Amino acid sequence: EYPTVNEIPVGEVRLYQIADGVWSHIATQSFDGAVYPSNGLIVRDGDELLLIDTAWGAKNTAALLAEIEKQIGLPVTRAVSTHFHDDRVGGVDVLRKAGVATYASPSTRRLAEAEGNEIPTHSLEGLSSSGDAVRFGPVELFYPGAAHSTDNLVVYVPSANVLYGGXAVLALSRTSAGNVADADLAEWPTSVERIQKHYPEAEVVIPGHGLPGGLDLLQHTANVVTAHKN
Numbered sequence: 001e002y003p004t005v006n007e008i009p010v011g012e013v014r015l016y017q018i019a020d021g022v023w024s025h026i027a028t029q030s031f032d033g034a035v036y037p038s039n040g041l042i043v044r045d046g047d048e049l050l051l052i053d054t055a056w057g058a059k060n061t062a063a064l065l066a067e068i069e070k071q072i073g074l075p076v077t078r079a080v081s082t083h084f085h086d087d088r089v090g091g092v093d094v095l096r097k098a099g100v101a102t103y104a105s106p107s108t109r110r111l112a113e114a115e116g117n118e119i120p121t122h123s124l125e126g127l128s129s130s131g132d133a134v135r136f137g138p139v140e141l142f143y144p145g146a147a148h149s150t151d152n153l154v155v156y157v158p159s160a161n162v163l164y165g166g167x168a169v170l171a172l173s174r175t176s177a178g179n180v181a182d183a184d185l186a187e188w189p190t191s192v193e194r195i196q197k198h199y200p201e202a203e204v205v206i207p208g209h210g211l212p213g214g215l216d217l218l219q220h221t222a223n224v225v226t227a228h229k230n
């Protein structure tokens with residue numbers, strides 16, 4: 001029942017309940033000659049919502065807000081982008097116009113601006129060093145170190161033991177490290193180890209792309225990324 005690229009059209013967004021108060025948002029986009037699905041996270045905090053990552057571009061992200069207001073009906077008050085690539089900050093302008101307060105680490109904001117990407121308004125402090133963690137709303141934000149990108153963040157929802165890895169974490173179907181132009185292949189396995197050590201009670205793990213799983217996703221990512229390096 002988890003949506004796939006064939007089941008979502010580009011421009012459409014689907015939401016998928018993972019737990020009480022926790023959803024993923026799945027979108028599709030054309031990129032690098034392909035059509036790819038992409039995952040994000042929605043987390044209820046009272047009668048409010050925290051958005052984790054855009055839906056990949058203005059158009060998708062507006063549909064995301066419109067799907068949310070239809071299917072959930074609570075306002076998105078804040079959004080965090082987990083790294084600087086356009087698939088995660090694209091739509092930040094739409095969120096801002098909708099009234100959403102957009103956040104990212106200072107390094108993400110720097111890298112986004114230098115890339116010509118949209119820039120979240122607010123800076124997240126206390127995430128500058130590998131292994132740093134801060135509470136942000138009802139989730140924890142963790143910088144495991146460089147992986148898919150130097151700046152990528154992962155997000156833990158302790159109330160539901162749900163771990164959102166973004167593109168630092170690979171679905172089980174994945175056999176390659178993906179688009180590694182911006183990745184630190186040398187550091188990524190160590191970064192996945194910091195995730196694994198910090199979240200041993202994670203019950204559901206959501207990769208940046210594809211199907212959810214359990215803690216098996218982390219070791220899979222580590223396997224793939226190590227084999228790539230060697």
Ligand SMILES: O=C(N[C@@H](Cc1c[nH]c2ccccc12)C(=O)O)c1nc(Cl)c2ccccc2c1O
Binds near residue numbers: 177178179180210
């Ligand atoms: O989607 C990305 N990468 C994926 C690709 C992938 C492999 N296999 C897949 C299977 C399904 C969906 C996506 C995949 C991955 O690296 O794993 C992606 N990567 C980079 Cl650097 C980007 C840079 C700038 C702007 C957008 C980007 C982006 O969307």
Ligand SMILES: [Zn+2]
Binds near residue numbers: 083167
């Ligand atoms: Zn990326």
